[PDB]
Amino acid sequence: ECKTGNGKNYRGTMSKTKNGITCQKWSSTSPHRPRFSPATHPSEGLEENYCRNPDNDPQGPWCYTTDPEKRYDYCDILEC
Ligand SMILES: [Cl-]
Ligand SMILES: [Cl-]
């Protein structure tokens, strides 16, 4: 678990955002409804509640949040 680039191929194990709030399972639909999931983007690594980049976001790995008022947010992934 290290990152390189926008973290596109990142198949790491981090499950909390940069502010230490824990990620929402990408399969789950609360508190937020994900626009990306394992059923639609099977090649994207949407397993558990880990930090991915299904959309080649320039800011790197993010995940759906568990704080009902925070939709998504980035992950502090060690630099590779
Ligand atoms: Cl939502
Ligand atoms: Cl999105």
Tab-separated table of N, CA, C and O and ligand atoms in Angstrom:
chain	number	residue	atom	x	y	z
A	1	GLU	N	0.833	-1.164	0.000
A	1	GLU	CA	0.000	0.000	0.000
A	1	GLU	C	0.897	1.252	0.000
A	1	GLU	O	1.391	1.705	1.027
A	2	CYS	N	0.969	1.755	-1.191
A	2	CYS	CA	1.700	2.992	-1.467
A	2	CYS	C	0.994	3.444	-2.770
A	2	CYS	O	0.306	2.658	-3.449
A	3	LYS	N	1.202	4.731	-2.978
A	3	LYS	CA	0.579	5.350	-4.145
A	3	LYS	C	1.681	5.878	-5.056
A	3	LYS	O	2.786	6.140	-4.621
A	4	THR	N	1.282	6.023	-6.287
A	4	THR	CA	2.115	6.559	-7.343
A	4	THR	C	1.080	7.071	-8.365
A	4	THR	O	0.236	6.245	-8.752
A	5	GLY	N	1.219	8.334	-8.676
A	5	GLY	CA	0.271	8.933	-9.657
A	5	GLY	C	-1.031	9.333	-8.975
A	5	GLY	O	-1.008	9.604	-7.762
A	6	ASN	N	-2.096	9.400	-9.749
A	6	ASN	CA	-3.393	9.782	-9.181
A	6	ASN	C	-3.882	8.616	-8.334
A	6	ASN	O	-5.005	8.688	-7.847
A	7	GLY	N	-3.102	7.581	-8.222
A	7	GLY	CA	-3.427	6.375	-7.453
A	7	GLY	C	-4.459	5.534	-8.202
A	7	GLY	O	-5.327	4.917	-7.544
A	8	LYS	N	-4.359	5.495	-9.513
A	8	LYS	CA	-5.273	4.728	-10.366
A	8	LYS	C	-5.276	3.208	-10.213
A	8	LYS	O	-6.336	2.530	-10.287
A	9	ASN	N	-4.091	2.631	-10.039
A	9	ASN	CA	-3.932	1.185	-9.928
A	9	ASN	C	-3.854	0.734	-8.459
A	9	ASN	O	-3.542	-0.446	-8.235
A	10	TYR	N	-4.118	1.700	-7.609
A	10	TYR	CA	-4.036	1.486	-6.174
A	10	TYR	C	-5.045	0.446	-5.713
A	10	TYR	O	-6.247	0.756	-5.769
A	11	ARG	N	-4.482	-0.647	-5.246
A	11	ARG	CA	-5.302	-1.736	-4.699
A	11	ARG	C	-4.936	-1.971	-3.230
A	11	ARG	O	-4.958	-3.134	-2.780
A	12	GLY	N	-4.610	-0.873	-2.551
A	12	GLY	CA	-4.242	-0.806	-1.168
A	12	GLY	C	-5.430	-1.168	-0.268
A	12	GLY	O	-6.524	-1.469	-0.762
A	13	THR	N	-5.190	-1.026	1.027
A	13	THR	CA	-6.132	-1.385	2.079
A	13	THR	C	-6.640	-0.330	3.022
A	13	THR	O	-7.280	-0.755	4.029
A	14	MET	N	-6.388	0.924	2.739
A	14	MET	CA	-6.847	2.070	3.551
A	14	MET	C	-8.380	2.205	3.363
A	14	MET	O	-8.808	2.122	2.191
A	15	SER	N	-9.019	2.460	4.496
A	15	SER	CA	-10.475	2.599	4.548
A	15	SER	C	-11.004	3.800	5.318
A	15	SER	O	-12.158	3.722	5.740
A	16	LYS	N	-10.194	4.806	5.507
A	16	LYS	CA	-10.533	6.047	6.204
A	16	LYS	C	-9.935	7.189	5.367
A	16	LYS	O	-8.943	7.128	4.604
A	17	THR	N	-10.638	8.305	5.489
A	17	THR	CA	-10.193	9.481	4.696
A	17	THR	C	-9.082	10.192	5.459
A	17	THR	O	-8.699	9.841	6.592
A	18	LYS	N	-8.614	11.214	4.779
A	18	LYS	CA	-7.569	12.119	5.234
A	18	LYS	C	-7.858	12.765	6.577
A	18	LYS	O	-6.905	13.209	7.244
A	19	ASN	N	-9.078	12.803	7.059
A	19	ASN	CA	-9.542	13.372	8.312
A	19	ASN	C	-10.018	12.278	9.288
A	19	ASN	O	-10.837	12.538	10.197
A	20	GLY	N	-9.471	11.126	9.029
A	20	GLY	CA	-9.740	9.977	9.871
A	20	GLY	C	-11.175	9.540	10.052
A	20	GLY	O	-11.494	8.896	11.080
A	21	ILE	N	-11.972	9.865	9.056
A	21	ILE	CA	-13.381	9.393	9.119
A	21	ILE	C	-13.394	8.243	8.105
A	21	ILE	O	-12.818	8.266	6.999
A	22	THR	N	-14.023	7.174	8.589
A	22	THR	CA	-14.137	5.901	7.871
A	22	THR	C	-15.083	5.872	6.703
A	22	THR	O	-16.229	6.374	6.716
A	23	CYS	N	-14.536	5.251	5.663
A	23	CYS	CA	-15.170	5.047	4.364
A	23	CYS	C	-16.412	4.166	4.426
A	23	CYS	O	-16.499	3.302	5.294
A	24	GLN	N	-17.327	4.462	3.516
A	24	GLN	CA	-18.593	3.729	3.337
A	24	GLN	C	-18.380	2.633	2.293
A	24	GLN	O	-17.669	2.882	1.261
A	25	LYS	N	-18.953	1.457	2.555
A	25	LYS	CA	-18.757	0.338	1.570
A	25	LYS	C	-19.365	0.837	0.238
A	25	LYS	O	-20.483	1.385	0.228
A	26	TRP	N	-18.609	0.651	-0.814
A	26	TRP	CA	-18.927	1.011	-2.185
A	26	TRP	C	-20.147	0.193	-2.679
A	26	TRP	O	-20.739	0.561	-3.722
A	27	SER	N	-20.426	-0.892	-1.968
A	27	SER	CA	-21.579	-1.748	-2.328
A	27	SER	C	-22.854	-1.177	-1.698
A	27	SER	O	-23.938	-1.188	-2.316
A	28	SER	N	-22.722	-0.642	-0.519
A	28	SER	CA	-23.742	-0.035	0.328
A	28	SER	C	-24.330	1.213	-0.265
A	28	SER	O	-23.676	1.829	-1.117
A	29	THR	N	-25.533	1.592	0.123
A	29	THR	CA	-26.255	2.769	-0.391
A	29	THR	C	-26.700	3.797	0.648
A	29	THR	O	-27.681	4.547	0.442
A	30	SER	N	-26.010	3.893	1.757
A	30	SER	CA	-26.247	4.844	2.838
A	30	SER	C	-24.908	5.033	3.598
A	30	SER	O	-24.072	4.115	3.631
A	31	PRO	N	-24.689	6.216	4.172
A	31	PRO	CA	-25.639	7.334	4.167
A	31	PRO	C	-25.717	7.879	2.726
A	31	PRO	O	-26.641	8.603	2.333
A	32	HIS	N	-24.738	7.525	1.917
A	32	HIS	CA	-24.661	7.980	0.530
A	32	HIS	C	-24.887	6.878	-0.501
A	32	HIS	O	-24.585	5.697	-0.260
A	33	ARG	N	-25.369	7.282	-1.661
A	33	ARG	CA	-25.604	6.385	-2.788
A	33	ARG	C	-24.437	6.574	-3.777
A	33	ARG	O	-24.333	7.626	-4.412
A	34	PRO	N	-23.596	5.560	-3.912
A	34	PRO	CA	-22.437	5.621	-4.785
A	34	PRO	C	-22.833	5.554	-6.273
A	34	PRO	O	-23.738	4.837	-6.745
A	35	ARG	N	-22.094	6.338	-7.036
A	35	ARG	CA	-22.159	6.552	-8.469
A	35	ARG	C	-21.267	5.499	-9.157
A	35	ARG	O	-21.291	5.345	-10.393
A	36	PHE	N	-20.505	4.834	-8.314
A	36	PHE	CA	-19.593	3.761	-8.736
A	36	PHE	C	-19.757	2.606	-7.738
A	36	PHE	O	-19.857	2.827	-6.515
A	37	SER	N	-19.752	1.411	-8.306
A	37	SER	CA	-19.858	0.200	-7.456
A	37	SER	C	-19.282	-1.017	-8.174
A	37	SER	O	-18.984	-0.973	-9.371
A	38	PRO	N	-19.095	-2.092	-7.412
A	38	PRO	CA	-18.557	-3.337	-7.928
A	38	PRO	C	-19.433	-3.974	-9.026
A	38	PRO	O	-18.975	-4.814	-9.846
A	39	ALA	N	-20.715	-3.611	-9.051
A	39	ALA	CA	-21.629	-4.181	-10.063
A	39	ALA	C	-21.537	-3.504	-11.420
A	39	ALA	O	-21.841	-4.124	-12.441
A	40	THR	N	-21.146	-2.251	-11.440
A	40	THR	CA	-21.029	-1.424	-12.626
A	40	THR	C	-19.632	-1.207	-13.164
A	40	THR	O	-19.454	-1.093	-14.389
A	41	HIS	N	-18.624	-1.140	-12.312
A	41	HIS	CA	-17.199	-0.937	-12.630
A	41	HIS	C	-16.371	-2.054	-11.967
A	41	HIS	O	-15.599	-1.747	-11.067
A	42	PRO	N	-16.586	-3.259	-12.497
A	42	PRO	CA	-15.947	-4.478	-11.992
A	42	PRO	C	-14.430	-4.480	-12.010
A	42	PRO	O	-13.801	-5.108	-11.147
A	43	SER	N	-13.814	-3.757	-12.892
A	43	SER	CA	-12.373	-3.598	-13.034
A	43	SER	C	-11.752	-2.517	-12.144
A	43	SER	O	-10.522	-2.212	-12.222
A	44	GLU	N	-12.599	-1.897	-11.336
A	44	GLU	CA	-12.153	-0.799	-10.494
A	44	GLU	C	-11.772	-1.029	-9.074
A	44	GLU	O	-11.409	-0.015	-8.435
A	45	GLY	N	-11.811	-2.214	-8.510
A	45	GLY	CA	-11.364	-2.530	-7.151
A	45	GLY	C	-12.243	-1.998	-6.016
A	45	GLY	O	-11.734	-1.659	-4.934
A	46	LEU	N	-13.531	-1.983	-6.265
A	46	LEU	CA	-14.524	-1.458	-5.312
A	46	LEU	C	-14.895	-2.479	-4.240
A	46	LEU	O	-16.084	-2.766	-4.015
A	47	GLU	N	-13.866	-2.980	-3.597
A	47	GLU	CA	-14.028	-3.973	-2.540
A	47	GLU	C	-13.929	-3.334	-1.147
A	47	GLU	O	-13.099	-2.429	-0.916
A	48	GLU	N	-14.809	-3.850	-0.280
A	48	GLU	CA	-14.880	-3.388	1.113
A	48	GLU	C	-15.168	-1.891	1.123
A	48	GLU	O	-16.046	-1.456	0.334
A	49	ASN	N	-14.446	-1.171	1.949
A	49	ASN	CA	-14.677	0.303	2.046
A	49	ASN	C	-13.335	0.985	1.892
A	49	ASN	O	-12.951	1.905	2.637
A	50	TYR	N	-12.594	0.529	0.906
A	50	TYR	CA	-11.264	1.072	0.639
A	50	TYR	C	-11.338	2.204	-0.396
A	50	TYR	O	-12.247	2.248	-1.207
A	51	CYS	N	-10.318	3.012	-0.315
A	51	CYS	CA	-9.975	4.176	-1.089
A	51	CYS	C	-9.553	3.707	-2.490
A	51	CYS	O	-8.564	2.978	-2.653
A	52	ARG	N	-10.349	4.119	-3.468
A	52	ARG	CA	-10.099	3.805	-4.889
A	52	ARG	C	-10.131	5.114	-5.701
A	52	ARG	O	-10.221	6.216	-5.140
A	53	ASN	N	-10.037	4.959	-7.006
A	53	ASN	CA	-10.080	6.086	-7.962
A	53	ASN	C	-10.710	5.567	-9.258
A	53	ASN	O	-10.017	5.401	-10.277
A	54	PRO	N	-12.025	5.299	-9.204
A	54	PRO	CA	-12.788	4.743	-10.320
A	54	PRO	C	-12.904	5.664	-11.533
A	54	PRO	O	-13.381	5.213	-12.592
A	55	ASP	N	-12.493	6.885	-11.226
A	55	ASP	CA	-12.672	7.920	-12.259
A	55	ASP	C	-11.440	8.693	-12.648
A	55	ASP	O	-11.569	9.742	-13.331
A	56	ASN	N	-10.272	8.177	-12.303
A	56	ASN	CA	-9.009	8.830	-12.676
A	56	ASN	C	-9.011	10.321	-12.256
A	56	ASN	O	-8.567	11.269	-12.962
A	57	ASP	N	-9.487	10.529	-11.017
A	57	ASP	CA	-9.570	11.816	-10.305
A	57	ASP	C	-8.088	12.223	-10.159
A	57	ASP	O	-7.252	11.372	-9.781
A	58	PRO	N	-7.825	13.475	-10.454
A	58	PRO	CA	-6.476	14.015	-10.461
A	58	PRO	C	-5.881	14.201	-9.063
A	58	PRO	O	-4.641	14.363	-8.911
A	59	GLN	N	-6.739	14.196	-8.072
A	59	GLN	CA	-6.334	14.368	-6.676
A	59	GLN	C	-5.985	13.056	-5.982
A	59	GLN	O	-5.467	13.123	-4.849
A	60	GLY	N	-6.218	11.947	-6.680
A	60	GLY	CA	-5.888	10.625	-6.138
A	60	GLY	C	-7.039	9.951	-5.414
A	60	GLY	O	-8.151	10.495	-5.497
A	61	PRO	N	-6.714	8.808	-4.772
A	61	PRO	CA	-7.668	8.000	-3.981
A	61	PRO	C	-8.551	8.680	-2.950
A	61	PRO	O	-8.188	9.433	-2.014
A	62	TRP	N	-9.823	8.376	-3.125
A	62	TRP	CA	-10.923	8.904	-2.312
A	62	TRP	C	-11.837	7.711	-2.060
A	62	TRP	O	-11.515	6.612	-2.537
A	63	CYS	N	-12.908	7.934	-1.348
A	63	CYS	CA	-13.948	6.979	-1.007
A	63	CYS	C	-15.187	7.753	-0.531
A	63	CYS	O	-15.166	8.909	-0.057
A	64	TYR	N	-16.269	6.992	-0.622
A	64	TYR	CA	-17.582	7.546	-0.143
A	64	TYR	C	-17.406	7.534	1.378
A	64	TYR	O	-16.814	6.597	1.985
A	65	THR	N	-17.903	8.590	1.992
A	65	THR	CA	-17.770	8.754	3.467
A	65	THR	C	-19.005	8.193	4.177
A	65	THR	O	-20.014	7.849	3.544
A	66	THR	N	-18.792	8.102	5.486
A	66	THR	CA	-19.779	7.593	6.445
A	66	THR	C	-20.422	8.705	7.276
A	66	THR	O	-21.319	8.463	8.109
A	67	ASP	N	-19.943	9.919	7.156
A	67	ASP	CA	-20.457	11.112	7.848
A	67	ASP	C	-21.494	11.634	6.812
A	67	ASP	O	-21.105	11.985	5.687
A	68	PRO	N	-22.747	11.544	7.236
A	68	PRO	CA	-23.903	11.914	6.412
A	68	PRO	C	-23.785	13.292	5.799
A	68	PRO	O	-24.427	13.550	4.765
A	69	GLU	N	-22.979	14.141	6.373
A	69	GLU	CA	-22.814	15.466	5.771
A	69	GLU	C	-21.571	15.554	4.925
A	69	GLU	O	-21.317	16.642	4.377
A	70	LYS	N	-20.785	14.502	4.762
A	70	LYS	CA	-19.576	14.516	3.918
A	70	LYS	C	-19.696	13.372	2.924
A	70	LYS	O	-19.554	12.185	3.270
A	71	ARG	N	-19.952	13.727	1.689
A	71	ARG	CA	-20.148	12.777	0.590
A	71	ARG	C	-18.932	11.933	0.283
A	71	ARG	O	-18.948	10.717	0.515
A	72	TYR	N	-17.915	12.558	-0.233
A	72	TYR	CA	-16.661	11.887	-0.584
A	72	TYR	C	-15.566	12.776	0.055
A	72	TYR	O	-15.879	13.864	0.586
A	73	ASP	N	-14.362	12.250	0.006
A	73	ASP	CA	-13.154	12.851	0.494
A	73	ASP	C	-11.988	11.908	0.175
A	73	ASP	O	-12.162	10.668	0.066
A	74	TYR	N	-10.850	12.576	-0.009
A	74	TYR	CA	-9.563	11.932	-0.351
A	74	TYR	C	-8.935	11.100	0.763
A	74	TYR	O	-9.286	11.192	1.944
A	75	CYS	N	-8.015	10.205	0.410
A	75	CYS	CA	-7.267	9.397	1.426
A	75	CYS	C	-5.864	9.710	1.576
A	75	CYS	O	-5.325	10.084	0.502
A	76	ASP	N	-5.309	9.661	2.776
A	76	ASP	CA	-3.865	9.992	2.924
A	76	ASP	C	-3.057	8.716	2.644
A	76	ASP	O	-2.623	8.017	3.579
A	77	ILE	N	-2.814	8.414	1.362
A	77	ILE	CA	-2.088	7.193	0.965
A	77	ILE	C	-0.594	7.380	0.851
A	77	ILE	O	-0.199	8.266	0.073
A	78	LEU	N	0.199	6.563	1.554
A	78	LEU	CA	1.665	6.774	1.440
A	78	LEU	C	2.111	6.769	-0.017
A	78	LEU	O	1.709	6.019	-0.899
A	79	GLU	N	2.976	7.772	-0.175
A	79	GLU	CA	3.588	8.086	-1.457
A	79	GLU	C	4.566	6.970	-1.798
A	79	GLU	O	5.328	6.487	-0.947
A	80	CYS	N	4.481	6.610	-3.057
A	80	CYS	CA	5.331	5.507	-3.536
A	80	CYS	C	6.539	6.071	-4.279
A	80	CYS	O	7.663	5.805	-3.715
B	1	CL	CL	-25.730	10.508	-1.960
B	2	CL	CL	-18.083	10.586	-8.994
